[PDB]
Design a binder for this molecule. Sequence first.
Ligand SMILES: *[C@@H]1O[C@H](CO)[C@@H](O[C@@H]2O[C@H](CO)[C@@H](O[C@@H]3O[C@H](CO[C@H]4O[C@H](CO[C@H]5O[C@H](CO)[C@@H](O)[C@H](O)[C@@H]5O)[C@@H](O)[C@H](O[C@H]5O[C@H](CO)[C@@H](O)[C@H](O)[C@@H]5O)[C@@H]4O)[C@@H](O)[C@H](O[C@H]4O[C@H](CO)[C@@H](O)[C@H](O)[C@@H]4O)[C@@H]3O)[C@H](O)[C@H]2NC(C)=O)[C@H](O)[C@H]1NC(C)=O
Ligand SMILES: C[C@@H]1O[C@@H](O)[C@H](O)[C@H](O)[C@H]1O
Ligand SMILES: [Ca+2]
Ligand code: NA
Length: 419
Amino acid sequence: LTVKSTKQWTIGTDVQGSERLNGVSYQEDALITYGDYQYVTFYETAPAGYLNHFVKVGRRRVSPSVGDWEFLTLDDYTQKTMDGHNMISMGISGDGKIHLSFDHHDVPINYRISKNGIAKDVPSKWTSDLFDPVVHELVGSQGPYSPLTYPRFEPLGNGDLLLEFRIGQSGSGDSYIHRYSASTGKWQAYGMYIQGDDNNAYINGLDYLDGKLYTSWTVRETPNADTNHGVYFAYSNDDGKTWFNTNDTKLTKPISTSDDSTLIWDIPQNSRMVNQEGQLIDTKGRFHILMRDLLSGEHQYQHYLRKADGTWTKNAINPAGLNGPDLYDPRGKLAGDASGEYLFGILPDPVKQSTGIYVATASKDFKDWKSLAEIPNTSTEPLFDKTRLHESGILSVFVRQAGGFPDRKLQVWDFELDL
Ligand SMILES: *[C@@H]1O[C@H](CO)[C@@H](O[C@@H]2O[C@H](CO)[C@@H](O[C@@H]3O[C@H](CO[C@H]4O[C@H](CO[C@H]5O[C@H](CO)[C@@H](O)[C@H](O)[C@@H]5O)[C@@H](O)[C@H](O[C@H]5O[C@H](CO)[C@@H](O)[C@H](O)[C@@H]5O)[C@@H]4O)[C@@H](O)[C@H](O[C@H]4O[C@H](CO)[C@@H](O)[C@H](O)[C@@H]4O)[C@@H]3O)[C@H](O)[C@H]2NC(C)=O)[C@H](O)[C@H]1NC(C)=O
Ligand SMILES: C[C@@H]1O[C@@H](O)[C@H](O)[C@H](O)[C@H]1O
Ligand SMILES: [Ca+2]
Ligand code: NA
């Protein structure tokens, strides 16, 4: 497996401040291909300057040929909170509508949707008038809508879209799911699916494949990040209403964080494992978790694999030259190709200030990690475009640079693989 071409585009100038607002691990998602177009979303500085930002949405044609980016600016909502939690997630439903949810740390929902199905009936002009106003509810559904953190979207097989988030606070919170119907244009409440017990679950993402929805998490006792413990797993066969553990045992609804039947690896507190890293369902149905810990005596990225035959294994990701991350270092992701044979680790290196792309293969039980490429000069939690990789064999990664304002740019890097 080799890289056929590498290309990069500078798409904006990152915002000034001591927190990272663009390129955050739990943006789900930031960079999405739908049909012939790729879409991206990020904050840029508004005319009032420091600590005033607008959401931008970019699109470019990627098929049959790659075209230039064009951007619209949503200049009717000013983001003003210098807090790295307050990121943007985007999702696209099967009616072609683009959904955005943004700017939360324990506050009421901020959500908006396109007026028409602009990712399906593609408009000639890309302007802010394409979007409806910001609202603080999900029409058709019910609250609670506050205090919300961590909006995540997941598209489903019939064109519907899940929106998932935490209600509560660090160290005491629950998680909820809502479902948007592409046929009716309405949301509906699926309710609380994980319930804290004087703690909160931090999921790594949502992964959907062939009618099943998968998630993994750790449990945090207090606002101190050293108090994460455990690696947990569950899946649903009905889009989030009914959940099962790794042994196919039906769970209570909601799942309590005090129920150990979802535990797949005992990791104590003070292991230097961080919440909200990465996960992946590969196209062969194997489930992968990316975390980190110090338990071997060195800081290392860790790969948890759920095999076909229910087994779980844990193996360090330690290719030559990769510096292992501590608790507060940037978080990575796992990507997979359409065939299910290739697993990509998109791993930020906290010493080199770069993002490494590593590959392992199912034929070698994913133990053959090799360097494939590097993105230099990054201070980012890398994010990638799942659909573009599956459909085109192009690994497309959104990054925030290292460096100081206003030199620090936002970029998309495309690695064309000879898959
Ligand atoms: C339902 O699903 C669950 C989840 O998959 C499943 O439970 C697993 O069952 C398998 C097989 O029965 C167990 O696998 C064995 O584990 C042996 C010891 O496990 C210990 O270590 C686990 C890993 O943590 C270690 O390392 C981390 C650092 O990475 C560290 O933090 C830990 O302290 C620890 O050192 C750990 O998760 C596990 O903890 C469970 O058990 C303890 C009590 O023992 C409990 O207190 C915990 O809360 C938790 O329940 C435990 O501490 C291991 O020695 C053994 O290896 C032998 O067999 C393999 C064959 O595969 C050989 O390769 C090897 O050479 C040895 O001969 C084997 O790997 C696994 O531990 C269970 N996992 C959990 C979370 O319980 C249930 O069986 C399923 N039930 C049904 C009905 O299907
Ligand atoms: C460790 C800490 O945990 C949560 O508050 C968020 O994920 C944040 O981004 C991370 O820095
Ligand atoms: Ca996802
Ligand atoms: Na608590």
